Amino acid sequence: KPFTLPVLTIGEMTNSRFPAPIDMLYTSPNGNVVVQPQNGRCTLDGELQGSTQLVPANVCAFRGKITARIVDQAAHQWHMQIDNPNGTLFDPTEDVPAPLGTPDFKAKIFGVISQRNDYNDGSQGPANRAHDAVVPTTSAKFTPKLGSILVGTWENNDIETQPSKFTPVGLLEMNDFNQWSLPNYSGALTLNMGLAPAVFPTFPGEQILFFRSFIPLKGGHGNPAIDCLLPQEWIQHFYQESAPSQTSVALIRYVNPDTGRVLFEGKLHRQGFITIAKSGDGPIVVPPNGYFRFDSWVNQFYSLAPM
Ligand SMILES: C[C@H](CCC(=O)NCC(=O)O)[C@H]1CC[C@H]2[C@@H]3[C@H](O)C[C@@H]4C[C@H](O)CC[C@]4(C)[C@H]3CC[C@]12C
């Protein structure tokens, strides 16, 4: 069964690590950083890894129920028991780091917590409320592997012990934001388990190619970005196809359909990430209609043309 890529321009792709369209291609040496995201992870033959699931709306979202105020915190802080972001119960026994779609980076994540009561007020139906909220993945009480997280709100009174959804919007602040720093999915207890492995180039002169989205920031200065190894569409595609990988590397070419010419080439590794022959930190300048084309199976030590 032949391996394929979907035919998509970068304006038609979705970030697999934060709910946002892809804004640009991006590359970096990432010298003293371990690139090990848990969302957006899928082998070329369709094996999901880490905390990766299929629905873009579930990425960095939470669903569950607020059960109490955080102990010894009389204001602004809520204990939220979480399920899988698709309402299904969460089994901590499974070899995953967290409920699928849980954020895979340290940050104060800004969004909205919304509640629909699970009972009716007479003929009117259930009551509702929604407020600005923060999920600090840096908190010791961020323990999604154990089924609970801390949620902070500016509202201190209008929150009930009721079914709750967290819709992510962006970052609250730049402080403690590191997109390559994995959260302690079990807080101060044990360590992280079920992880997708770190990815890195193994051939000299190569760097990882990222699909980058710039995400909102509630205050302060900065231009925070989320890089993913694979767009969500490729993950959904590989999962459907499950095409066997003939080698460890698929040779892909970025093609301009207007001129028909190849602009650059990259190595799509079996583990689900791209390397290119390029040095430096910055965007890859590309035309609007360009797309990736799968051309050949090659070896781990294939030499790419420098770009
Ligand atoms: C308690 C948590 C996280 C604390 C932390 O980083 N480490 C301590 C720990 O290990 O829990 C903090 C981090 C950011 C805080 C929020 C943000 O500062 C924004 C906001 C500021 C308002 O003055 C109070 C509510 C509100 C919404 C804060 C509530 C408490 C939060 C959610």
Tab-separated table of C-alpha atoms and ligand atoms in Angstrom:
chain	number	residue	atom	x	y	z
A	1	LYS	CA	0.000	0.000	0.000
A	2	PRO	CA	1.599	3.232	-1.207
A	3	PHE	CA	2.488	6.057	1.158
A	4	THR	CA	0.955	9.445	0.356
A	5	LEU	CA	0.766	12.993	1.670
A	6	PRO	CA	-2.385	15.112	1.435
A	7	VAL	CA	-2.080	17.973	-1.048
A	8	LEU	CA	-2.288	21.112	1.093
A	9	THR	CA	-0.776	24.573	1.133
A	10	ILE	CA	0.404	25.917	4.468
A	11	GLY	CA	-2.676	28.160	4.481
A	12	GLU	CA	-4.741	24.946	4.515
A	13	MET	CA	-2.999	23.270	7.474
A	14	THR	CA	-3.755	23.189	11.200
A	15	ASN	CA	-1.234	23.310	14.027
A	16	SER	CA	-1.223	19.972	15.840
A	17	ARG	CA	-0.016	21.423	19.180
A	18	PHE	CA	-2.323	24.452	19.513
A	19	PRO	CA	-5.715	25.218	17.893
A	20	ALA	CA	-4.548	27.629	15.180
A	21	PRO	CA	-3.769	27.664	11.446
A	22	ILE	CA	-0.169	27.246	10.359
A	23	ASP	CA	1.408	30.661	9.753
A	24	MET	CA	4.816	29.749	8.306
A	25	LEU	CA	7.511	27.145	7.919
A	26	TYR	CA	10.326	27.571	10.420
A	27	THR	CA	13.692	26.015	11.225
A	28	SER	CA	16.175	26.320	14.071
A	29	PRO	CA	19.286	24.589	15.438
A	30	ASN	CA	17.686	24.201	18.899
A	31	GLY	CA	21.184	23.647	20.286
A	32	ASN	CA	20.572	23.216	24.025
A	33	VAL	CA	16.902	22.167	23.794
A	34	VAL	CA	15.303	18.713	23.672
A	35	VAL	CA	12.502	18.706	21.072
A	36	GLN	CA	10.008	16.208	22.526
A	37	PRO	CA	6.413	17.350	21.996
A	38	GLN	CA	3.626	14.940	22.919
A	39	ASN	CA	0.879	16.388	20.750
A	40	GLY	CA	1.307	16.210	17.007
A	41	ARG	CA	3.114	12.847	17.148
A	42	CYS	CA	2.427	10.095	14.612
A	43	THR	CA	4.607	7.612	12.748
A	44	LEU	CA	4.467	7.553	8.956
A	45	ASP	CA	2.544	4.254	9.097
A	46	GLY	CA	-0.179	5.744	11.291
A	47	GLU	CA	0.779	5.003	14.915
A	48	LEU	CA	-0.256	7.822	17.239
A	49	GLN	CA	2.144	8.523	20.101
A	50	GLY	CA	2.385	10.717	23.172
A	51	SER	CA	-0.881	12.483	23.953
A	52	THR	CA	-1.840	12.821	20.280
A	53	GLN	CA	-5.460	12.425	19.180
A	54	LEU	CA	-7.325	13.258	15.981
A	55	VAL	CA	-9.675	16.184	16.720
A	56	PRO	CA	-8.058	19.655	16.429
A	57	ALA	CA	-10.703	21.158	18.736
A	58	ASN	CA	-9.449	18.918	21.569
A	59	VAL	CA	-5.852	20.191	21.436
A	60	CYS	CA	-5.041	22.055	24.686
A	61	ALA	CA	-8.704	21.823	25.711
A	62	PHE	CA	-10.020	20.392	28.965
A	63	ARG	CA	-13.373	18.839	29.791
A	64	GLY	CA	-14.621	17.628	33.139
A	65	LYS	CA	-15.970	19.074	36.360
A	66	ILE	CA	-14.840	21.577	38.963
A	67	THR	CA	-15.195	19.801	42.300
A	68	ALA	CA	-13.944	22.347	44.861
A	69	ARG	CA	-11.742	25.327	45.495
A	70	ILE	CA	-8.050	24.515	45.674
A	71	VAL	CA	-7.252	23.473	49.238
A	72	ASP	CA	-5.793	26.307	51.344
A	73	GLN	CA	-6.630	28.773	48.538
A	74	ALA	CA	-9.729	30.784	49.443
A	75	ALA	CA	-9.969	32.718	46.165
A	76	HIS	CA	-9.508	32.537	42.386
A	77	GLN	CA	-8.314	28.900	42.303
A	78	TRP	CA	-10.370	25.833	41.378
A	79	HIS	CA	-9.788	22.075	41.423
A	80	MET	CA	-10.968	20.694	38.070
A	81	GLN	CA	-11.347	16.946	37.618
A	82	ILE	CA	-10.773	16.200	33.937
A	83	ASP	CA	-11.928	13.492	31.558
A	84	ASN	CA	-10.716	12.963	28.030
A	85	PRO	CA	-11.571	16.175	26.108
A	86	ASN	CA	-14.244	14.150	24.276
A	87	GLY	CA	-16.243	13.431	27.438
A	88	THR	CA	-15.050	9.834	27.692
A	89	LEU	CA	-13.653	8.629	31.009
A	90	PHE	CA	-9.883	8.843	31.461
A	91	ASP	CA	-8.018	5.645	32.317
A	92	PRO	CA	-4.675	6.452	34.016
A	93	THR	CA	-3.669	2.813	33.437
A	94	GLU	CA	-3.101	3.356	29.706
A	95	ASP	CA	0.492	4.052	28.640
A	96	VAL	CA	-0.082	7.715	27.804
A	97	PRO	CA	1.314	10.819	29.535
A	98	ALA	CA	-2.082	12.505	30.035
A	99	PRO	CA	-5.618	12.631	28.582
A	100	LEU	CA	-5.194	12.926	24.831
A	101	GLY	CA	-4.894	16.557	23.760
A	102	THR	CA	-3.555	17.826	27.091
A	103	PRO	CA	-1.049	20.672	26.521
A	104	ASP	CA	2.530	19.450	26.131
A	105	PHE	CA	4.374	22.623	27.169
A	106	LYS	CA	4.917	24.741	30.270
A	107	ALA	CA	2.927	27.992	30.260
A	108	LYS	CA	0.169	29.991	31.891
A	109	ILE	CA	-2.453	29.134	29.264
A	110	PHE	CA	-5.226	31.695	28.861
A	111	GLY	CA	-8.734	30.757	27.836
A	112	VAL	CA	-12.347	30.606	28.929
A	113	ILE	CA	-13.849	28.160	31.404
A	114	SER	CA	-17.533	27.578	30.655
A	115	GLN	CA	-20.152	25.626	32.579
A	116	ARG	CA	-23.507	24.096	31.662
A	117	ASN	CA	-25.344	22.766	34.705
A	118	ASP	CA	-26.232	19.071	34.603
A	119	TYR	CA	-29.773	19.778	35.869
A	120	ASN	CA	-32.635	22.017	34.776
A	121	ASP	CA	-34.124	25.099	36.420
A	122	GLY	CA	-37.730	24.145	35.765
A	123	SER	CA	-38.920	24.624	32.201
A	124	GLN	CA	-36.055	27.026	31.393
A	125	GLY	CA	-33.346	24.375	31.101
A	126	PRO	CA	-29.886	24.421	32.668
A	127	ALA	CA	-28.072	27.528	33.855
A	128	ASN	CA	-24.815	28.628	32.228
A	129	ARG	CA	-21.759	30.768	32.911
A	130	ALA	CA	-18.364	31.399	31.336
A	131	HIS	CA	-15.351	33.387	32.510
A	132	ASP	CA	-11.745	34.119	31.633
A	133	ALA	CA	-9.485	31.431	33.049
A	134	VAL	CA	-5.857	30.352	33.269
A	135	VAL	CA	-4.489	26.812	33.324
A	136	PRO	CA	-0.916	26.955	34.684
A	137	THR	CA	0.813	23.871	33.330
A	138	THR	CA	3.761	24.966	35.510
A	139	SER	CA	1.723	24.388	38.681
A	140	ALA	CA	2.471	21.514	41.036
A	141	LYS	CA	-1.313	20.994	40.947
A	142	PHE	CA	-1.266	20.459	37.167
A	143	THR	CA	-1.604	16.667	37.433
A	144	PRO	CA	-3.596	15.620	34.340
A	145	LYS	CA	-2.130	12.103	34.434
A	146	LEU	CA	-3.840	11.821	37.838
A	147	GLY	CA	-7.070	13.294	36.453
A	148	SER	CA	-7.018	16.824	37.886
A	149	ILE	CA	-5.677	20.303	37.129
A	150	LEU	CA	-5.754	23.725	38.759
A	151	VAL	CA	-7.859	26.402	37.046
A	152	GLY	CA	-7.539	30.072	37.990
A	153	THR	CA	-10.227	32.675	37.328
A	154	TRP	CA	-10.527	36.394	37.945
A	155	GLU	CA	-14.130	35.729	38.964
A	156	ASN	CA	-14.204	34.620	42.601
A	157	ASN	CA	-17.897	33.814	43.132
A	158	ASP	CA	-19.688	32.743	39.929
A	159	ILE	CA	-18.250	29.231	39.597
A	160	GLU	CA	-20.146	26.070	40.518
A	161	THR	CA	-19.230	22.419	41.049
A	162	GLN	CA	-20.627	21.597	37.633
A	163	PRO	CA	-19.553	20.248	34.220
A	164	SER	CA	-16.859	22.517	32.823
A	165	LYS	CA	-15.075	23.077	29.515
A	166	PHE	CA	-11.844	25.015	29.010
A	167	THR	CA	-11.548	26.632	25.575
A	168	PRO	CA	-7.900	27.633	25.007
A	169	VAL	CA	-7.178	31.045	23.505
A	170	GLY	CA	-3.454	31.656	24.043
A	171	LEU	CA	-0.865	32.584	26.672
A	172	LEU	CA	-1.586	34.738	29.702
A	173	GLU	CA	2.019	35.965	29.850
A	174	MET	CA	5.482	35.164	28.531
A	175	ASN	CA	6.779	34.312	32.017
A	176	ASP	CA	7.701	30.606	32.303
A	177	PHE	CA	6.584	29.886	28.724
A	178	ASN	CA	8.836	27.296	27.075
A	179	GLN	CA	7.212	25.335	24.257
A	180	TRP	CA	9.849	22.578	24.504
A	181	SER	CA	9.593	22.136	28.287
A	182	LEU	CA	7.280	19.222	29.035
A	183	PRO	CA	4.903	19.702	31.978
A	184	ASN	CA	5.122	17.346	34.940
A	185	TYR	CA	1.970	15.451	33.988
A	186	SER	CA	1.930	13.884	37.477
A	187	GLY	CA	2.971	17.060	39.304
A	188	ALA	CA	5.427	16.433	42.129
A	189	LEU	CA	4.585	12.700	42.039
A	190	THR	CA	6.799	10.138	40.256
A	191	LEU	CA	7.718	11.318	36.701
A	192	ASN	CA	6.285	11.315	33.165
A	193	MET	CA	5.304	8.071	31.411
A	194	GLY	CA	4.157	6.894	27.986
A	195	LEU	CA	6.183	9.585	26.224
A	196	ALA	CA	6.819	9.928	22.527
A	197	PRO	CA	10.608	10.067	22.059
A	198	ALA	CA	12.743	13.129	21.498
A	199	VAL	CA	13.442	13.999	17.863
A	200	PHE	CA	16.674	15.427	16.469
A	201	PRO	CA	18.650	15.425	13.211
A	202	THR	CA	21.219	12.644	12.921
A	203	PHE	CA	22.902	13.772	9.681
A	204	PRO	CA	25.432	16.647	9.670
A	205	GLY	CA	24.204	19.984	8.360
A	206	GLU	CA	20.513	19.234	8.959
A	207	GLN	CA	17.904	20.960	11.126
A	208	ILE	CA	14.297	20.162	11.966
A	209	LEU	CA	11.641	21.884	9.851
A	210	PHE	CA	8.693	23.102	11.927
A	211	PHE	CA	5.143	24.183	11.119
A	212	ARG	CA	4.817	27.384	13.145
A	213	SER	CA	1.787	29.251	14.486
A	214	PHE	CA	1.930	32.554	16.356
A	215	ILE	CA	-0.583	32.380	19.194
A	216	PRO	CA	-2.412	35.112	21.156
A	217	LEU	CA	-0.952	36.696	24.277
A	218	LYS	CA	-3.144	38.395	26.864
A	219	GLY	CA	-0.609	40.957	28.093
A	220	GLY	CA	2.951	42.170	27.870
A	221	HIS	CA	5.449	42.137	25.031
A	222	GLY	CA	6.413	39.234	22.816
A	223	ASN	CA	5.497	37.160	19.764
A	224	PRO	CA	5.032	33.647	21.170
A	225	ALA	CA	4.959	30.759	18.715
A	226	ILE	CA	4.042	27.072	18.789
A	227	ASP	CA	6.006	24.771	16.478
A	228	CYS	CA	4.683	21.349	15.528
A	229	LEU	CA	6.508	18.536	13.765
A	230	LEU	CA	3.517	17.568	11.591
A	231	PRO	CA	0.315	19.415	10.688
A	232	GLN	CA	-2.810	17.844	12.138
A	233	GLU	CA	-3.962	16.964	8.613
A	234	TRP	CA	-0.932	14.732	8.019
A	235	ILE	CA	-1.587	12.967	11.325
A	236	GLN	CA	-5.228	12.360	10.409
A	237	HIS	CA	-4.067	11.186	6.974
A	238	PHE	CA	-1.408	8.729	8.156
A	239	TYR	CA	-3.803	7.305	10.753
A	240	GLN	CA	-6.369	6.617	8.022
A	241	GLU	CA	-3.868	5.148	5.554
A	242	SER	CA	-1.492	3.167	7.801
A	243	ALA	CA	0.764	2.772	4.782
A	244	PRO	CA	3.842	0.660	5.615
A	245	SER	CA	7.113	2.584	5.648
A	246	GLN	CA	9.494	1.054	3.112
A	247	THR	CA	12.508	2.787	4.694
A	248	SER	CA	13.151	5.064	7.679
A	249	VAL	CA	13.037	8.246	5.557
A	250	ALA	CA	10.558	9.556	2.993
A	251	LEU	CA	12.003	12.122	0.578
A	252	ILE	CA	9.557	15.020	0.204
A	253	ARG	CA	9.836	18.028	-2.108
A	254	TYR	CA	8.259	21.455	-1.676
A	255	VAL	CA	6.881	22.315	-5.113
A	256	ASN	CA	5.550	25.535	-6.607
A	257	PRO	CA	2.604	24.438	-8.800
A	258	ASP	CA	2.648	27.745	-10.704
A	259	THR	CA	6.135	27.191	-12.138
A	260	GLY	CA	6.224	23.434	-11.496
A	261	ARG	CA	9.721	23.731	-10.023
A	262	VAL	CA	11.049	22.230	-6.810
A	263	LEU	CA	11.994	24.855	-4.226
A	264	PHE	CA	13.595	22.663	-1.554
A	265	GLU	CA	13.626	19.081	-0.335
A	266	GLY	CA	13.444	17.481	3.084
A	267	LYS	CA	13.665	14.142	4.853
A	268	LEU	CA	10.381	12.977	6.395
A	269	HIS	CA	11.494	10.510	9.058
A	270	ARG	CA	9.529	7.418	10.052
A	271	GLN	CA	9.002	8.790	13.572
A	272	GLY	CA	7.071	11.763	12.160
A	273	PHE	CA	9.250	14.839	11.666
A	274	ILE	CA	11.094	16.671	8.895
A	275	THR	CA	14.755	17.612	8.515
A	276	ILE	CA	16.259	19.954	5.912
A	277	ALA	CA	19.805	20.861	4.876
A	278	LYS	CA	19.932	24.377	6.302
A	279	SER	CA	21.783	26.309	8.990
A	280	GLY	CA	20.300	29.172	10.983
A	281	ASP	CA	17.192	30.257	12.851
A	282	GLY	CA	14.249	31.744	10.990
A	283	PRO	CA	11.375	31.311	8.555
A	284	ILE	CA	11.436	29.472	5.245
A	285	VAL	CA	10.159	31.863	2.566
A	286	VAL	CA	7.659	30.073	0.306
A	287	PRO	CA	5.017	30.977	-2.273
A	288	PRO	CA	1.346	30.776	-1.259
A	289	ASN	CA	0.450	27.781	-3.458
A	290	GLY	CA	3.432	25.587	-2.568
A	291	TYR	CA	2.809	22.068	-1.302
A	292	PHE	CA	4.776	19.028	-0.168
A	293	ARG	CA	5.113	16.126	-2.612
A	294	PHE	CA	6.242	12.634	-1.648
A	295	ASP	CA	8.835	11.460	-4.153
A	296	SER	CA	10.877	8.508	-2.901
A	297	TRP	CA	11.924	6.251	-0.043
A	298	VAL	CA	15.576	6.884	0.877
A	299	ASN	CA	18.080	5.877	3.556
A	300	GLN	CA	18.784	7.533	6.898
A	301	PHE	CA	22.018	8.943	5.409
A	302	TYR	CA	20.605	10.456	2.212
A	303	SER	CA	22.217	13.803	1.376
A	304	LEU	CA	19.743	16.652	0.921
A	305	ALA	CA	20.498	19.632	-1.285
A	306	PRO	CA	21.394	22.601	0.964
A	307	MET	CA	18.818	25.388	0.970
B	1	LIG	C1	-1.767	29.317	41.432
B	1	LIG	C2	-1.451	29.487	39.953
B	1	LIG	C3	-0.080	28.858	39.627
B	1	LIG	C4	1.023	29.159	40.634
B	1	LIG	C5	2.390	28.662	40.205
B	1	LIG	O1	2.866	28.928	39.099
B	1	LIG	N1	3.048	27.918	41.085
B	1	LIG	C6	2.513	27.581	42.391
B	1	LIG	C7	2.021	26.151	42.369
B	1	LIG	O2	2.871	25.233	42.331
B	1	LIG	O3	0.784	25.937	42.379
B	1	LIG	C8	-1.509	30.958	39.485
B	1	LIG	C9	-0.628	31.202	38.243
B	1	LIG	C10	-1.243	32.392	37.491
B	1	LIG	C11	-2.385	32.859	38.409
B	1	LIG	C12	-3.505	33.707	37.803
B	1	LIG	C13	-2.932	34.861	36.972
B	1	LIG	O4	-1.959	35.571	37.742
B	1	LIG	C14	-4.020	35.804	36.478
B	1	LIG	C15	-5.051	36.237	37.525
B	1	LIG	C16	-4.514	37.387	38.382
B	1	LIG	C17	-5.540	37.874	39.371
B	1	LIG	O5	-5.013	38.949	40.152
B	1	LIG	C18	-5.924	36.730	40.287
B	1	LIG	C19	-6.537	35.592	39.467
B	1	LIG	C20	-5.633	35.044	38.339
B	1	LIG	C21	-6.531	34.194	37.420
B	1	LIG	C22	-4.458	34.180	38.907
B	1	LIG	C23	-4.918	33.000	39.778
B	1	LIG	C24	-3.791	32.078	40.241
B	1	LIG	C25	-2.872	31.597	39.098
B	1	LIG	C26	-3.654	30.672	38.142
